[PDB]
């Protein structure tokens with residue numbers, strides 16, 4: 185019994201792992217995930233940057249980061265409104281970095297942005313035009329998470 | 334060996350349980366669930382109240398119940414059309430109670446409602462503009478389920 | 483006690499099987515599955531027929547097949563654009579068969595179709611008004627999968 189039941193449960197476990205992978209694939213498909221493309225998702229809720237980060241972290245994803253013009257448009261279409269991007273200059277003013285680490289490679293700043301306006305702006309939002317504007321991390325904008333291709 | 338294999342499998346099971354909970358979270362998020370708010374969802378199918386209760390129960394949820402104006406609006410946006418709410422006055426006429434227990438607190442009745450029209454109306458539907466109208470439990474309306482915050 | 487841990491493991495696994503089944507039911511419900519009806523899903527991606535077949539098969543479904551007018555309307559709403567159906571006359575020119583086996587019965591051909599136009603057309607797309615047109619399997623149309631009732 186013992187060894188047999190143990191061997192059976194290993195098979196039951198592997199079977200459940202396969203089924204759950206399948207469920208995840210179907211869910212990504214249903215949410216618009218395109219072959220070989222990373223995918224962005226939103227619950228359409230607007231909140232402070234720190235809350236977006238914590239929320240995407242729970243889902244094992246990251247705050248949406250467009251690495252090129254295609255991903256930038258993709259994020260725009262998903263959000264439908266202003267949304268925080270996974271980019272800030274919180275560590276060194278004027279120097280924007282990805283929350284996943286590293287200096288910017290692609291950017292689509294609105295004219296004369298980023299400007300750290302008034303009391304200060306260390307976060308970034310993609311606006312209803314695809315362009316970027318640095319804004320207060322305390323302001324509430326749409327939460328858009330990103331998952332791997 | 335045996336004790337080690339069993340321990341390693343108990344660890345795989347724990348990881349799998351966490352992954353499934355993550356799948357449930359991502360799904361709810363993708364379907365619009367707001368932080369600290371109940372999750373309302375519909376398949377857009379109209380059916381009698383008895384069936385809506387059976388369906389939500391099978392999904393381990395319950396028929397949608399608006400506890401306040403905010404939830405009422407959230408349910409309205411999800412339903413899109415007339416939908417049953419988890420409220421009835423089957424016990425004492427005029428005394429509406431939640432299907433999960435307790436007396437009705439918040440309400441958003443339409444002018445001249447509830448009227449227990451004709452042979453009687455002991456169920457409730459959220460209709461145009463989010464107002465409420467009591468209706469026969471045998472009539473078919475949209476099935477909207479709620480899941481905890 | 484080895485046997486006590488094994489019995490708990492069995493209970494943990496069964497609880498997980500039940501919870502995954504509920505997650506799948508809730509997802510299908512959230513995607514619009516009507517009671518006792520098969521349901522359709524699309525990621526809105528356009529690709530050649532062989533890829534759509536591969537994708538749906540990997541998700542344990544099949545390329546969508548309208549068996550009647552209701553299902554045809556349901557597929558049309560989901561697709562929003564031209565989409566391949568699980569119907570072809572690849573095996574014997576002129577005789578359309580379901581990819582899962584059997585001769586085509588219900589059909590919704592546009593006037594003057596199917597016509598195996600030019601070098602040939604062995605696949606089928608649901609297009610404008612939900613009518614059908616036979617087209618080259620190499621063309622790229624929206625991927626729509628169907629899952630059992």
Ligand SMILES: CO[C@H]1O[C@H](CO)[C@@H](O)[C@H](O)[C@@H]1O
Nearest residue numbers: 297299301305317318319320
């Ligand atoms: C007044 O502040 C706002 O407008 C300026 C430009 O006018 C932006 O730079 C800033 O981030 C705010 O959105």
Ligand SMILES: CO[C@H]1O[C@H](CO)[C@@H](O)[C@H](O)[C@@H]1O
Nearest residue numbers: 446448450454466467468469
């Ligand atoms: C005729 O019955 C219907 O219309 C009245 C108001 O006109 C409602 O109160 C009732 O529930 C039914 O919807």
Ligand SMILES: CO[C@H]1O[C@H](CO)[C@@H](O)[C@H](O)[C@@H]1O
Nearest residue numbers: 595597599603615616617618
């Ligand atoms: C030119 O070919 C296109 O148009 C004809 C009818 O005009 C269809 O039958 C065919 O599949 C193509 O869509």
Ligand SMILES: [Ca+2]
Nearest residue numbers: 274277304306
């Ligand atoms: Ca600063």
Ligand SMILES: [Ca+2]
Nearest residue numbers: 273300305306
């Ligand atoms: Ca700054």
Ligand SMILES: [Ca+2]
Nearest residue numbers: 299301317318
């Ligand atoms: Ca700015």
Ligand SMILES: [Ca+2]
Nearest residue numbers: 422426453455
């Ligand atoms: Ca009554």
Ligand SMILES: [Ca+2]
Nearest residue numbers: 422449454455
């Ligand atoms: Ca009544």
Ligand SMILES: [Ca+2]
Nearest residue numbers: 448450466467
């Ligand atoms: Ca009434």
Ligand SMILES: [Ca+2]
Nearest residue numbers: 571575602604
């Ligand atoms: Ca042929």
Ligand SMILES: [Ca+2]
Nearest residue numbers: 597598599600
């Ligand atoms: Ca011809």
Ligand SMILES: [Ca+2]
Nearest residue numbers: 571598603604
């Ligand atoms: Ca043909």
Ligand SMILES: [Ca+2]
Nearest residue numbers: 597599615616
């Ligand atoms: Ca044709």
Ligand SMILES: [Cl-]
Nearest residue numbers: 305306320321
């Ligand atoms: Cl800031």
Ligand SMILES: [Cl-]
Nearest residue numbers: 454455469470
């Ligand atoms: Cl009634």
Ligand SMILES: [Cl-]
Nearest residue numbers: 603604618619
């Ligand atoms: Cl062909």
